[PDB]
Each structure stands twice: as structure tokens, then as C-alpha cells.
Amino acid sequence: HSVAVIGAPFSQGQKRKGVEHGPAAIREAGLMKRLSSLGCHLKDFGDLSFTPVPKDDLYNNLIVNPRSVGLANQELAEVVSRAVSDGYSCVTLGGDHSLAIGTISGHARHCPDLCVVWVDAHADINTPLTTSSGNLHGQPVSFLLRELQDKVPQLPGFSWIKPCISSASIVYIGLRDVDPPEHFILKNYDIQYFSMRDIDRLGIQKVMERTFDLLIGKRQRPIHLSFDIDAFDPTLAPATGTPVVGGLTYREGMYIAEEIHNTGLLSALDLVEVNPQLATSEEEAKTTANLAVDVIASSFGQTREGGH
Amino acid sequence: HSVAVIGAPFSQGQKRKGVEHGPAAIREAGLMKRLSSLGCHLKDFGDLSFTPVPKDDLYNNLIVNPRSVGLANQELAEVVSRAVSDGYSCVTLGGDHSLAIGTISGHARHCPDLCVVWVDAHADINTPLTTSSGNLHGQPVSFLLRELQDKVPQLPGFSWIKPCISSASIVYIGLRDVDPPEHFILKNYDIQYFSMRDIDRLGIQKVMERTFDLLIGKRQRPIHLSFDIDAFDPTLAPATGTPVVGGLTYREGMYIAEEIHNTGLLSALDLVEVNPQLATSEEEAKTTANLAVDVIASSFGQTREGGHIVYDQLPTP
Amino acid sequence: QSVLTQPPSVSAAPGQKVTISCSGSSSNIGNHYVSWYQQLPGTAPKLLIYDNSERPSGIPDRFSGSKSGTSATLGITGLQTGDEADYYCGTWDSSLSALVFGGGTKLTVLGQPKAAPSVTLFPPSSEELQANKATLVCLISDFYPGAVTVAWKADSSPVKAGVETTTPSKQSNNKYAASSYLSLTPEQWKSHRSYSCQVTHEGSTVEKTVA
Ligand SMILES: [Mn+2]
Ligand SMILES: [Mn+2]
Ligand SMILES: [Mn+2]
Ligand SMILES: [Mn+2]
Numbered sequence: 001h002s003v004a005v006i007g008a009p010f011s012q013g014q015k016r017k018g019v020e021h022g023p024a025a026i027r028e029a030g031l032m033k034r035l036s037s038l039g040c041h042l043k044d045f046g047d048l049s050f051t052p053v054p055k056d057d058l059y060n061n062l063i064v065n066p067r068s069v070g071l072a073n074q075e076l077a078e079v080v081s082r083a084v085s086d087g088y089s090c091v092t093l094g095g096d097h098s099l100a101i102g103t104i105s106g107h108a109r110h111c112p113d114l115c116v117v118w119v120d121a122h123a124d125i126n127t128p129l130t131t132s133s134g135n136l137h138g139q140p141v142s143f144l145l146r147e148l149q150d151k152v153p154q155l156p157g158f159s160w161i162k163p164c165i166s167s168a169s170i171v172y173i174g175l176r177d178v179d180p181p182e183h184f185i186l187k188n189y190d191i192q193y194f195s196m197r198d199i200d201r202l203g204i205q206k207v208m209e210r211t212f213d214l215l216i217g218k219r220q221r222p223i224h225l226s227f228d229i230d231a232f233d234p235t236l237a238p239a240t241g242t243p244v245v246g247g248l249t250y251r252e253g254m255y256i257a258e259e260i261h262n263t264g265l266l267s268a269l270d271l272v273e274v275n276p277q278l279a280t281s282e283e284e285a286k287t288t289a290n291l292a293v294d295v296i297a298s299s300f301g302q303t304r305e306g307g308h
Numbered sequence: 309h310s311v312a313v314i315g316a317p318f319s320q321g322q323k324r325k326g327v328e329h330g331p332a333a334i335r336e337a338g339l340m341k342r343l344s345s346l347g348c349h350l351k352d353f354g355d356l357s358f359t360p361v362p363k364d365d366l367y368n369n370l371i372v373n374p375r376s377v378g379l380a381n382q383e384l385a386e387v388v389s390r391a392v393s394d395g396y397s398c399v400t401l402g403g404d405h406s407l408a409i410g411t412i413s414g415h416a417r418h419c420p421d422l423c424v425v426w427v428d429a430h431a432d433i434n435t436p437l438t439t440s441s442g443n444l445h446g447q448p449v450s451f452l453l454r455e456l457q458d459k460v461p462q463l464p465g466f467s468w469i470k471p472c473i474s475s476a477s478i479v480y481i482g483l484r485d486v487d488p489p490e491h492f493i494l495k496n497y498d499i500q501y502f503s504m505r506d507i508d509r510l511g512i513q514k515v516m517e518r519t520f521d522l523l524i525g526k527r528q529r530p531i532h533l534s535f536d537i538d539a540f541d542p543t544l545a546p547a548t549g550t551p552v553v554g555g556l557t558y559r560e561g562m563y564i565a566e567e568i569h570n571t572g573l574l575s576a577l578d579l580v581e582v583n584p585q586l587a588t589s590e591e592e593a594k595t596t597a598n599l600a601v602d603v604i605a606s607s608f609g610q611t612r613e614g615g616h617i618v619y620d621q622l623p624t625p
Numbered sequence: 626q627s628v629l630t631q632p633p634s635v636s637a638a639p640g641q642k643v644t645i646s647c648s649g650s651s652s653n654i655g656n657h658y659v660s661w662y663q664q665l666p667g668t669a670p671k672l673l674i675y676d677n678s679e680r681p682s683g684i685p686d687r688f689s690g691s692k693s694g695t696s697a698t699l700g701i702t703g704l705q706t707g708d709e710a711d712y713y714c715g716t717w718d719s720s721l722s723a724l725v726f727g728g729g730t731k732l733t734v735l736g737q738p739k740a741a742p743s744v745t746l747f748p749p750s751s752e753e754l755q756a757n758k759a760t761l762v763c764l765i766s767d768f769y770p771g772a773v774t775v776a777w778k779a780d781s782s783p784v785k786a787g788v789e790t791t792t793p794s795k796q797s798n799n800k801y802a803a804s805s806y807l808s809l810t811p812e813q814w815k816s817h818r819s820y821s822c823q824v825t826h827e828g829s830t831v832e833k834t835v836a
Contacts, residue, residue: 203511204508205508205509205510205511250553250554251504251507251508251554252508254504254505254508254554255505255508255509258505303503303505304483304484304485304503304504304505304554305483305484305486305491305503306485306486306487306488306490306491307488307491308488363719363722365722366717366719366722367657367717367724
């Protein structure tokens, strides 16, 4: 079918300036050639770089730098809504995980019955006060859960976000690093998740089979795959800002992506938290980037055996 | 049982040679000691022809090495036929995967009802028309299939090979890289295979259970295990040819070999593409070689939970 | 200055048969197989014969090739107008470690009958005369077939120095023709009371004069 590629160079203050180059890195790993080869019609929308520009670092991270995000997400959600209405499936390259706000928002505007699959070592379900203003990359999903609204504060630049999805409509895979409140939220609001323990407990195959029985069990729905790169074991994914050990095997992540493709309902995908500066060497960078390309490609049909 | 060890130092010209040291590396990893310890009769037939790769230039690539290879395989098939008739199980150290032609041929001459299990990232099943000029390392199966014969060309040195096996009697495990025609051939001729996806989706245990239900389901038959070293994840098997990532775990390949042993019907084994020149360091080389030794040993009984080596009782102080 | 020895030039009658020989040694033709290539007046040669005696489909049975010891042979029966071209014999040399060819054999299949070259030469130009660069131009045209030996008779003697002459090639009417230029200093043209362009084909001579 058709695929829209959206660069979203987001960043947390000072610590991980590099991650915005992620999109360019995944591109430079031949993302376009590979999706082209699968037979997908490819409209690349370039990068929607920081509209007010990367503002010089002084105060800002606690004041204007998060707003610049809130609005950037608004722009993204608009592009996504436009791309999704035009009939395209939406690939969003990151960039830090905040861009999930915009993408799931913009997606929900034409696909209001959408469900989410969250492949990430973290749940990134913190609130704007609980996990500070460092960044919302661990703090997005809240803005999108309708059950969490009574416990989230209206922030400057996030006035536009309306809760897209129920708690019983997002499923997590890969959870291995988690703040206490996130655990509470997930147990409290009855949100379904499979961590590495559950992976080891039941095995990747059963995880995807249960995941699909939960989300799209009784009615076909369009699926939003948000894939965080740290979800893969740091040996595989060494160029991510905050990497957690005891993560997914290469084969497991391809198996997820493959399974997602076979449902046929994939409507949009996010590939994020790939900061290449974090790599010690050129090879570390390219190997992570190349892994990304694979994940996207596997989700859009590429199988291990060559059917070209 | 009894086990015959055959060195076969094959090659596909310069930039791809070095695999000839393949058998010697496995040997130097204590292959003999370990098979000895399992309590199996060991006749080692040394290395084979090892035609000193003529003038390493010219049209030797075009005709001299391919003609010599085709015939080298003929010699091998003879040694295998001889070893197999004398009651031995046949271990063939490689060398490039092309030695599979001779071994499955020579095996078939006394065991015409044999079946094949092909553990390799690749299907190694092109026609010679599909050759990449650096030729035969990855299209050996074709000559052996008795349904792709009408579409494969009589080459110089390969006049002797008659199609040994049906398409429904080879099963592949470990598929990760496949050229378009090979995929076509496998779908077209209805050849059974289990890739990494099938491995992940079913588990190694079920793969072997299906594989045995296919091959030896309704009739006990001798099994030919052709094991390509690239089949294992490149982290495990870094000294191979065209190695592909997302390969089998160490424990999965032991599990295969172990399962194969338990059937009891292992008649011959190939261990191939073990190029040590490919390794960056001594450790990379030895680790791959050592992995090989394990695979052979696991296939012939080595159990990890302790050997089958008899102990009547323990000592007295 | 090639590797294999072919005869430089053959010619014969339309409807007849011709043989082109190829002389080599043990290292080339001795132990390895030979091939035949037809290169036309212009453009990329094509495979005519391969593996001594094999024709590609579309190459007619009018052609064939043979080989024994250190020599091979190309046979063409029912010789036709289109066949005239440069013919190359190609094989493999184990001692030189290189694919090798013959010098090449040019064919002139006699399509038409003989034609005389009516030579027309021009002297130093008035401009050139005062410009101290006299370039004698003796152009030859409308002749058949094959190259014509060209020479410059100078002051009751011969002259070979500072002289260029083009290859014979046919025009729209299939008249093969070439041109020769004699470069002198004004003095070279002054003292010498006579100059002439001497042109010779298969048969006879036709030379003009300039003073
Ligand atoms: Mn993460
Ligand atoms: Mn994340
Ligand atoms: Mn192989
Ligand atoms: Mn292989």
C-alpha cells in the first residue's frame, strides 16, 4: 500500500541534544530504499524542525523549551491527520518518545477506534508533575489516556490534546525499567502489559497472540505501533539515551513487527529514542540505525526469507 | 557406534578461500579426543584431494577449479560410499558447502531411502545458470533434487552425479537469507522448510518434532545432517561465509543435534563453511571451531548434563 | 603487434567459399578452445564461432570453424555482399595468463567490379603561400575495391617525411576513397621546380603534377 515518512527531531534539554539526528541516521541507513523494495508508495515529509529553532540553553528547559514541544506535537498531529486522511500509513522517525502524543492524537482524529501496541523498556506513562519537566518521553501516554485526565495538569502548549484512547485499548510490551507511580497507574487503571518476566513466562509467540485477542479480539481496529528503540537489549541497541539490560532479542522484535504486519491493520508506526551521539563508535551508531530500518520494514512486510 | 572422519578442503577461488583450513581448525579444536570420549570407533581418512588451486588466475575460476571441484566431489562420494558400506557413520569436515553434493551422493549409493536435514541460514539451492560466477558454494542441492534435474545443466566435472533425493525428503532449518529463485523453487516444488520465524513461532522443540514427522514419519530411514556453520547467530559463529544476523542460539543448535542423536538413525553428517581466515582474532577462530566440535559431538551423544560414559561405582578410602 | 597470427587480407568471388587460418602455439591453441569474431567496417564485433565449431543461433550454417594442434580455421560458404568485415580468432593462453586474439583478417567480398581512382590534387593556397605553411592536398575518390598505395614524387626523387594519408572508406554510392596531405615550408616548394602525388591501386598508376 502507501507509506508516509515524517521526521520529528524532538530533544530533552542538554542531556541528549543528539537524538534529533535520529531520523537522519535511520534515513542514512537506507530506510527509503528498503520500504521502496517492499512495493510501498513513499511520500517523505522531511523533518518538521523546531519552528522557533533550537533555543539557546538558559532557563528554557523548565519554561519555553517544553511549550516548543507541546506545539511541535500539535503540528505533527496535523501532518499525521492529513497523511492518514489521504489514505497513507504513517511512519514517524524520532527523536525522543514525546512525539507519541502528536502521532496517536493526529491518528485518532480519523481513526477514533484505534488501539496502541507500546514496545519499550519503559511505560512512559508519567504525569507532568510526578516525573518533573526534564522531559515527557517518560511522561507522554497520560495525555492520551481518558482515565488519567482528572490527575494531569493543563500545561502551556498542550491545551489542544484530547484523550484519544481508553486504558483497555493500549497494551505494553518490553517493560523492564519502571518508576513506582507508573507501576501504580498500570495496576490501578487496569492497563494490560507484558514485561520481560511475562516474555520469559509465556514466550514472544503467546504475547502477540494474547495482545491481539485483547485489542482487536471482537472487532477489527486500526493499530498504532509505537516502537521505542531501547526495547531491544543494549547489545543490539547501544545508541539509545537511556538503555536497559535484559531486553528483547533481534528475532523477538522482528517477530513482533512481522506479527503486527500479518494482522494487516497497521495504520501508523513510531520508531524513537535512537540518539546516535550516545554510540561510542560509527558501527554502534549504524548497527542501531540499521536495526531500526529492519523493525519498520518487518512491520510493512519484509520477511527473513526473500520473496522478491 | 563407528564414525569415519573425512577432511574435504573445497574453495571457490581467491577472496573466498581459507575454508580449506576449515577441517584442520575443527581437528585442532580436539574433534578426535571428544568423539573418542563418547566411545565411538574413529577412522580418520585425513584430508581429500586438495588440488593446490592450480595457478590462482586465468580461466581457472571459469573452468579449472569448477571442473576439479566436480571431480573432487566424485572422489569424496566414492570414499563416503566405501566408509558407509563398511558400516561407519560419516563425519565430513569442510570446506565450502559444495562437498554436500559428493557426501549425499556417496551416502545415497548404499542408503537410497536416506532423507536430509539442512541446518543453514541459506537454502544453497540455486541452478548453475543462477550462479554468481564465484560459483557452487550456494547451489549444491539442485544436482541432488530429482525434480529440478530437467532445469539444471550438465557441467564440466559433474557428469557422474545422478539425482539421489526427492523434494519431499529434504527439510531445511535456519533459513534467514534466500535469493528470489530459491524461494520460488521451494514454494514451486513444495519443499518443506522452517526459518527463524517458524523457530520463534513454534519453538526449536516443535521444529524437530515436525521435521521427524515429515522425513521419518511413516518409514524408519537413515538421516543425512548437513550443518552449515552460518546457521548459528554471527555472535556465536563469526568465522563463516555470508553470515546472517538473527541466527540460532547455541542451545537451539545443541538441541537439534541432540534430537537428531535420539532418533538413533544419523547415518552421516557435514559441518561446513568454517572459514578461519574470516576471523579478526585467534579467539573468534577457535570459538567457531569449538562450536563445530560441539555440534558433531552433540549429534553423536554428548549430552551436557553429563556423558553416557559408564561408571559402575565410585572409589573407597 | 598481437599474439595469434592471422593472414592480414583475403578476397574471393560472391557465391564461393573462403577459409581464414589462425596460427598459434601449445600455450594458446595447443590445449585451449578457439573462437571467431566478425567486426564490421565500424562498430562492436559479435560472436561468430565459439568452442572451435559452435555457432550461436541466428549465425547461419554458411559459416563453420575447425582446429587441430596449434592452428584453427574459419570456413564461409555461399559468400554474400554483407559478409565483408574484419575477422578475429580468439582463444586462451595459459603461459601468457591472458585471453589472446589474432591481428585480424580484413575481407573484401567482390560485390562490384574494379574502379579507377581519378586523382585531383590542389597546390599551396595564396593565403598559405604568404602564411609560410604550404600543405599540398591530393584527394582520391570513386574507386573500387580496397586501399590504394599513396606516395609523393618530389624534385625528380621520392619523399615520405611530414606526410599523412587516410584509410579507404566507401561513401553512399559505395566508392571507397582517402586523402593525403604533404606539409612543406615555402622554401621546400620554391627551389624544387616539380611536385606530384603518386597513387596506386590493385592495377595501374594515376599521378598528377604541381610546380
Ligand atoms: Mn524506552
Ligand atoms: Mn519510550
Ligand atoms: Mn550452506
Ligand atoms: Mn550458510
